[PDB]
């Protein structure tokens, strides 16, 4: 997923909050950093670890849902892409 991408301020700070530097990422990098954010903030359920809690987290504001499952791949990519701007470039 080499899609060249520039997050909107809120996703961007979400990513920067766990140490990302740039304004301009591949989709791959975004996914790496987003998974890290979720683990670093301890948003995943301990027992059913595909479940992610977003209530009173920043992640809830971006995604507009209180919880979601990582198994919902299309929904996940939809909720990401619409916090994201696709550049006119590789």
């Amino acid at each position: 997923q080499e899609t060249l991408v520039r997050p909107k301020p809120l996703l961007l700070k979400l990513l920067k909050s766990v140490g990302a530097q740039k304004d301009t990422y591949t989709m791959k990098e975004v996914l790496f950093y987003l998974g890290q954010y979720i683990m670093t903030k301890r948003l995943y359920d301990e027992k059913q670890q595909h479940i992610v809690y977003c209530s009173n987290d920043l992640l809830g504001d971006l995604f507009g849902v209180p919880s979601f499952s990582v198994k919902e791949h299309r929904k996940i990519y939809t909720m990401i892409y619409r916090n994201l701007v696709v550049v006119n470039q590789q």
């Binding site: 996914l31 683990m39 670890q49 990582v70 791949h73």
Partner: peptide, 13 residues
């Protein structure tokens, strides 16, 4: 069980 990390890796890396 499956780790969250493992679930997340399946999204696409």
């Amino acid at each position: 069980a499956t780790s969250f990390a493992e679930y997340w890796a399946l999204l696409x890396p």
